[PDB]
Amino acid sequence: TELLKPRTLADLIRILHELFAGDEVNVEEVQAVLEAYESNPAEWALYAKFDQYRYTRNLVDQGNGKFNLMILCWGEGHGSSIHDHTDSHCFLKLLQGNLKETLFDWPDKKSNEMIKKSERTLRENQCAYINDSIGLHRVENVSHTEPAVSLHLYSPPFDTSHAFDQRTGHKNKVTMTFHSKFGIRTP
Numbered sequence: 001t002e003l004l005k006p007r008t009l010a011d012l013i014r015i016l017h018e019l020f021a022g023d024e025v026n027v028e029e030v031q032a033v034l035e036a037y038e039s040n041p042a043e044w045a046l047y048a049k050f051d052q053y054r055y056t057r058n059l060v061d062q063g064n065g066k067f068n069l070m071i072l073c074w075g076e077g078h079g080s081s082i083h084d085h086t087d088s089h090c091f092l093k094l095l096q097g098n099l100k101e102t103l104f105d106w107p108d109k110k111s112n113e114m115i116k117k118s119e120r121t122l123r124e125n126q127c128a129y130i131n132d133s134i135g136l137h138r139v140e141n142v143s144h145t146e147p148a149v150s151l152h153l154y155s156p157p158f159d160t161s162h163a164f165d166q167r168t169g170h171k172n173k174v175t176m177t178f179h180s181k182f183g184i185r186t187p
């Protein structure tokens, strides 16, 4: 229960394994520890593998089955769908650059435009949190000049989730694909 500042990415991962040793999740503690880690680009360069056309997901740690820890690499103008998180916790920490997070409510059955609830700018080293009970979101690198890199933790792990059509609120199931795992490109 005593949270210490992670010295390095490796140290962070060790602390995370401790925090997820059990069956439940202390969200505030996990968020605090992620925020306390000061991004050091040398430590995660191995995972920072970009694609020219869309953002990439790069698996870093499998949390001994309790969580997926991954690094997402967002080119200029790259962004996500409006999506849920499959009944899992989702932590988002910025390692480089800025991302815009837009929040949406769960849609009703009637086909309507999904209206933004709010938006915020996540800045370097900040850590956001979302779950399905909170709502849906879109994450975007709106920069024209700076790539963004973020560190994501999902617990329990999931490899499918839903994308939502902003015009209708209709959803479709999407399978998550990893661009790399443990620094190895996995085509």
Ligand SMILES: [Cl-]
Residues within 6 Å of the ligand: 090, 092, 139, 152
């Ligand atoms: Cl996300």
Ligand SMILES: [Fe+2]
Residues within 6 Å of the ligand: 083, 084, 085, 090, 137, 139
């Ligand atoms: Fe998300």
